[PDB]
Design a protein around this ligand. Structure first.
Ligand SMILES: CN(C)Cc1ccc(S(=O)(=O)n2ccc(/C=C/C(=O)NO)c2)cc1
Ligand SMILES: [K+]
Ligand SMILES: [K+]
Ligand SMILES: [Zn+2]
Length: 358
């Protein structure tokens, strides 16, 4: 009798790269995930939540009006202008439909958050593109135009109270620089990220992503960065990180709503991440988060670029939200030595702020 929501809309496939049809952020990323849900017959077990466009008023919850106006103008640009405008950012391609698709993925998530916080569904999954977590207040970055998960947290605050406590768990393989920045001075939104770092060398190449960035002002303590260095990470490393850091801090935060920036480019077989998290692994992480916030969980697709890997992985995540038993997880071998060093580094950076860490 608890209902799981699912939002997907084909029109988000229209955002595309007109000079390199093989660019890895592919229209069929969302259609492959959705099709895999039909094959496992999870689709008919969920309630369909419709997509909509975000308003420009809603976009102003996190983004400047200058940044909204430039992306918006690209809907009518000639190809040569689309290319020149795209090159003014760090890793961005743009077509005439890009604007609408970025509006569609945020509006799909506002509707999903609204269904949760009125008690129409218990939890929800959002099969959307282009992704959001690199987008800054003032600019686009790394295939992202608007920060969908940040906009979703402010929209949720706007339909409840302003200080509603939102936990954002970001398990995409890259650091969510735009999201950290948007809430760095905020104690109402808890940002927890796992990400490949390599002493600042992995994308997005900034030392903002190290464990010593714990937040500013009244937000000191509410930013948790868990960086990996020098190892091909997998299910052991992520199970230990939840067990020691994510779940203690998050229980102590006691969120009223949980957003997952759910990128699957740390999954075994991705051509960018170099990690080996399994679909079983992602399922267990989902299952653990389900214990927070009276189960109010929203799963947001971010990165992830092996088509088979992202389909199997998110589908396991939907199977957890629907209530199925967690799958057989293999053996938690000891952690790569460097992954232990990483976890201890976060415990020492955050134990002054969280009484459940030492
Ligand atoms: C090594 N120096 C030159 C910097 C550098 C520049 C570009 C690229 S890139 O073009 O390969 N690139 C862009 C975005 C993503 C990931 C997106 C995602 O999944 N977020 O979740 C991957 C990598 C590195
Ligand atoms: K991340
Ligand atoms: K924060
Ligand atoms: Zn990524």
């Amino acid at each position: 009798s608890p209902i799981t929501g699912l939002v997907y809309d084909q029109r988000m496939m229209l955002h595309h790269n007109m000079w390199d049809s093989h660019h890895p952020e592919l229209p069929q990323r969302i259609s492959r995930i959705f099709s895999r849900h039909e094959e496992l017959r999870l689709l008919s077990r969920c309630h369909r939540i419709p997509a909509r466009l975000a308003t420009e008023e809603e976009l102003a919850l996190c983004h400047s009006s200058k940044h909204i106006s430039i992306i918006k103008s690209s809907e009518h640009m000639k190809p040569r202008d689309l290319n020149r405008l795209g090159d003014e950012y760090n890793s961005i391609f743009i077509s005439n439909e890009s604007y609408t698709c970025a509006l569609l993925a945020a509006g799909s998530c506002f509707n999903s958050a609204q269904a949760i916080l009125t008690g129409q569904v218990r939890n929800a999954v959002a099969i959307v593109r282009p992704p959001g977590h690199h987008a800054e207040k003032d600019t686009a970055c790394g295939f992202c135009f608007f920060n969908t998960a940040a906009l979703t947290a402010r929209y949720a605050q706007s339909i409840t109270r302003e200080s509603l406590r939102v936990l954002i768990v970001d398990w995409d393989v890259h650091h969510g620089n735009g999201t950290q920045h948007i809430f760095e001075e905020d104690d109402s939104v808890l940002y927890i990220s796992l990400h490949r770092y390599e002493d600042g060398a992995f994308f997005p190449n900034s030392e903002d992503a190290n464990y010593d960035k714990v937040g500013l002002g009244k937000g000191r303590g509410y930013n948790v960065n868990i960086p990996w260095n020098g190892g091909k990470m997998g299910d052991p490393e992520y199970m230990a990180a939840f067990h020691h850091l994510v779940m203690p801090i998050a229980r102590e935060f006691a969120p009223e709503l949980v957003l997952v920036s759910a990128g699957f480019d740390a999954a075994r077989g991705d051509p960018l991440g170099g990690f080996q998290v399994t679909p079983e692994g992602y399922a267990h992480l989902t299952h653990q988060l389900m214990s927070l916030a009276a189960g109010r969980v929203l799963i947001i697709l971010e990165g992830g670029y092996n088509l088979t890997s992202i389909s199997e992985s998110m589908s396991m995540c939907t199977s957890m939200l629907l209530g199925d038993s967690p799958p057989s997880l293999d053996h938690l071998t000891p952690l790569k030595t460097s992954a232990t060093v990483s976890i201890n580094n976060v415990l020492r950076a955050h134990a002054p702020f969280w009484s459940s860490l030492r």
